[PDB]
Each structure stands twice: as C-alpha cells, then as structure tokens.
Amino acid sequence: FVNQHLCGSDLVEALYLVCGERGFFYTDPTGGGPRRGIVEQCCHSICSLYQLENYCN
C-alpha cells in the first residue's frame, strides 16, 4: 500500500486492512460523502494506513 486514491470501496479494504480485527466503522453514516474526510480524501486525493488507522474503531 502507498499514497493511492482510495474510495469507500478500497476505503473499507484499506480500513479492512488497518483494522483487520480492531473493528472499523464508517463515520457520519447518513448523507453522501458524509465522512468525506476519508471518502473525499482517499477517493479524490490520497492517504496512508496512518489515515485509515484513525478511521478505525
């Protein structure tokens, strides 16, 4: 993994990676791109596990 573009799809994967068993979740689960911090970042820009490492439990 490296600086790549991750969207909700690859987001849950990367998150599914960084979390594995820590139990991850999706923040602001309501409107579209509600947790855009991730959904708008990794998807539009890029981030590292360290980022998704915070989006975990």
Curated annotation (Swiss-Prot):
<comment type="function">
    <text>Insulin decreases blood glucose concentration. It increases cell permeability to monosaccharides, amino acids and fatty acids. It accelerates glycolysis, the pentose phosphate cycle, and glycogen synthesis in liver.</text>
</comment>
<feature type="disulfide bond">
    <location>
        <begin position="42"/>
        <end position="47"/>
    </location>
</feature>
<feature type="disulfide bond" description="Interchain (between B and A chains)">
    <location>
        <begin position="19"/>
        <end position="56"/>
    </location>
</feature>
<feature type="disulfide bond" description="Interchain (between B and A chains)">
    <location>
        <begin position="7"/>
        <end position="43"/>
    </location>
</feature>
<comment type="similarity">
    <text>Belongs to the insulin family.</text>
</comment>
<comment type="subunit">
    <text>Heterodimer of a B chain and an A chain linked by two disulfide bonds.</text>
</comment>
<protein>
    <recommendedName>
        <fullName>Insulin</fullName>
    </recommendedName>
</protein>
